[PDB]
Design a protein around this ligand. Structure first.
Ligand SMILES: CCCCCCCC/C=C\CCCCCCCC(=O)O[C@H](COC(=O)CCCCCCCCCCCCCCC)COP(=O)([O-])OCC[N+](C)(C)C
Ligand SMILES: CC(C)CCC[C@@H](C)[C@H]1CC[C@H]2[C@@H]3CC=C4C[C@@H](O)CC[C@]4(C)[C@H]3CC[C@]12C
Ligand SMILES: CC(C)CCC[C@@H](C)[C@H]1CC[C@H]2[C@@H]3CC=C4C[C@@H](O)CC[C@]4(C)[C@H]3CC[C@]12C
Ligand SMILES: N[C@]1(C(=O)O)C[C@@H]2CC[C@H]1C2
Lengths: 52, 454
């Protein structure tokens, strides 16, 4: 209940959708690299363990 | 456009041993001993859960080679119990089972991977949530780019965790070479030992979600099951043997992380290897569950229970992108849970009730429709033994926990509103249909996905 392969490639191959899809891909991937930078910051900022 | 078959026997064994071996043998060895009281009963429930898993898994090899649809337990339930029972089954797995179990093994990945930066204090909770999320996101992205990536990742980490379990068993053998049963025996309590043990075997049914993606299912599905679960059972009883050679009962009952104490004792300056391998053991299971979970929802959308976009495929890569992006996002919502490990009781109740219904169905369908082909057939005793066993486990644990099980049934019954609205009663103003269509084609345009064919 949607576009066929034929109907999709006739619309979603437009340069506006190609640039949008590139933007979403890089937005996600920089977002994941940001979330890892966030975790690496917390792991440095956290109080280190008492020695034994 | 439809998904290519490319799971070999070896990649199917890697799916099962990779997805089962998981976290349970590192995070739950204390869990059985706290209910079983002594090593002689604790090391026995580890074998008993192995047996119940083996006979249930062989039973799934009969049922799977019979019906041969993907979507596993859900598909096999639809062919016997029909539309509403199968939808409630899938609605429980959509809302709670496959999200929560993925977030559970992701939190264990984060915790044990970070543990050598914080030995002998709690690991920072917010970093343990982020690294749980980073794992799920990266394995969703890998699983979207290529099944020949995700299966090689499964092979890689299925190997890694068996090497780690080999070290643990070997150090056990070294120790007993170098050189008893005070037990709280109660049928109302030993059941929670079993429910703790079985969580560590959960996953024998997972290869049944990819039968339409293996290269030769009538050989490789029943072979991958019976190669895999004896290996798992052996590794688990020998691993527990190792822990009980190294530690006292009072240590294992009071320590937060049994494999870390085992590492500390045997390896000293080199002890960080055991935490990291418990990490890598969980990581492999997040992959195996994202793999098999996405295929379940894809089937549930194909056979009309779940909104249409989830059935679609990205045609250049042949990966079920909308289903993976959904099961991923649905897993990250469990980050808003405090005592998430509580959900292992709900997981244990809901899972073996669904397997019970499936195996009741296995007998019922073999009597009701005997003309359907049986490329492997094993026995009529193993189904009966598994049904009376699992119904015992359900009835007795329910009897001991009515307050918890009662609210549990409201999760089940929450499906009927959604079922009637979406599947059957079908409230249908033409603006709603125009909106659902518009939303679906918008999602197609973003992800570049086309519906499944022939
Ligand atoms: C909700 C909508 C989805 C938003 C997320 C971005 C989707 C990007 C997209 O359409 O991918 C599409 C595919 O899918 C992927 O590329 C898989 C990775 C997607 C991200 C998975 C985790 C997302 C977290 C939740 C992009 O399709 P494509 O543009 O053909 O990809 C070309 C990729 N190379 C060859 C250039 C590398
Ligand atoms: C990086 C982006 C693109 C990933 C896509 C999903 C985004 C939108 C959302 C969905 C649920 C979200 C997580 C939900 C809960 C928590 C717990 C909190 O204590 C830290 C942030 C964290 C871990 C969130 C991070 C961002 C998150 C993963
Ligand atoms: C998503 C997958 C790849 C896991 C991501 C986990 C990240 C957050 C982990 C894995 C290994 C970790 C690093 C391992 C060792 C050190 C040295 C220490 O003196 C400071 C922290 C630091 C630099 C850690 C930061 C956090 C780290 C990068
Ligand atoms: N076997 C599991 C494990 O990792 O121990 C338990 C949950 C079901 C599949 C995985 C997650």
């Amino acid at each position: 209940t949607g576009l066929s392969k034929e109907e999709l490639l006739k619309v979603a191959g437009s340069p506006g959708w190609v640039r949008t899809r590139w933007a979403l891909l890089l937005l996600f991937w920089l977002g994941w690299l940001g979330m890892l930078a966030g975790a690496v910051v917390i792991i440095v900022r956290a109080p280190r363990c008492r020695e034994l | 456009v439809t998904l290519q078959r490319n799971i070999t026997l070896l990649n199917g064994v890697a799916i099962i041993v990779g997805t089962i071996i998981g976290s349970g043998i590192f995070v739950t060895p204390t869990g059985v001993l706290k209910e079983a009281g002594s090593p002689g009963l604790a090391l026995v429930v580890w074998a008993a859960c192995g047996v119940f898993s083996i006979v249930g898994a062989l039973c799934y090899a009969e049922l799977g080679t019979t019906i041969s649809k993907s979507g596993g337990d859900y598909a096999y339930m639809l062919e016997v119990y029909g539309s509403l029972p199968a939808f409630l089954k899938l609605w429980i797995e959509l809302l709670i089972i496959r999200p929560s179990s993925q977030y559970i093994v992701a939190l264990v990945f984060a915790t044990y991977l970070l543990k050598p930066l914080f030995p002998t204090c709690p690991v920072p909770e917010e970093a343990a949530k982020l690294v749980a999320c980073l794992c799920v996101l990266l394995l969703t992205a890998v699983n979207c780019y290529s099944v020949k990536a995700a299966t090689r990742v499964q092979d890689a980490f299925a190997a890694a965790k068996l090497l780690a379990l080999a070290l643990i068993i070997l150090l056990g053998f070294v120790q007993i070479g170098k050189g008893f049963e005070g037990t709280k025996l109660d049928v109302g309590n030993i059941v929670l030992a079993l429910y703790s043990g079985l969580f560590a075997y959960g996953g024998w049914n997972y290869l049944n979600f990819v039968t339409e993606e293996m290269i030769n299912p009538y050989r490789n599905l029943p072979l991958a099951i019976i190669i895999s679960l004896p290996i798992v059972t052996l590794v688990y009883v020998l691993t527990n043997l190792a822990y009980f050679t190294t530690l006292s009962t009072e240590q294992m009952l009071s320590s937060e992380a049994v494999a870390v104490d085992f590492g500390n004792y045997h390896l000293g300056v080199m002890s960080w290897i055991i935490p990291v391998f418990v990490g890598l053991s969980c990581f492999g299971s997040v992959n195996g569950s994202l793999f098999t979970s996405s295929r379940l929802f894809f089937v549930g959308s194909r056979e009309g229970h779940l909104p249409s976009i989830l059935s679609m495929i990205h045609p250049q890569l042949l990966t079920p992108v909308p289903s993976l992006v959904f099961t991923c996002v649905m897993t990250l919502l469990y980050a808003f849970s405090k005592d998430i490990f509580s959900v292992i009781n709900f997981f244990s109740f809901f899972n073996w009730l669904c397997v019970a219904l499936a195996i009741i169905g296995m007998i019922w369908l073999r009597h009701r429709k005997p003309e359907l082909e049986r490329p492997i057939k094993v026995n009529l005793a193993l189904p009966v033994f598994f049904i009376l066993a699992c119904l015992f486990l359900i009835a007795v644990s329910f009897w001991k926990t009515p307050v918890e099980c009662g609210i549990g049934f409201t999760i089940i019954l929450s499906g009927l509103p959604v079922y009637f609205f979406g599947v059957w009663w079908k409230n249908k103003p033409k603006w709603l249909l125009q909106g659902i269509f518009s939303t679906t084609v918008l999602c197609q345009k973003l992800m570049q996905v086309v519906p499944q064919e022939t």
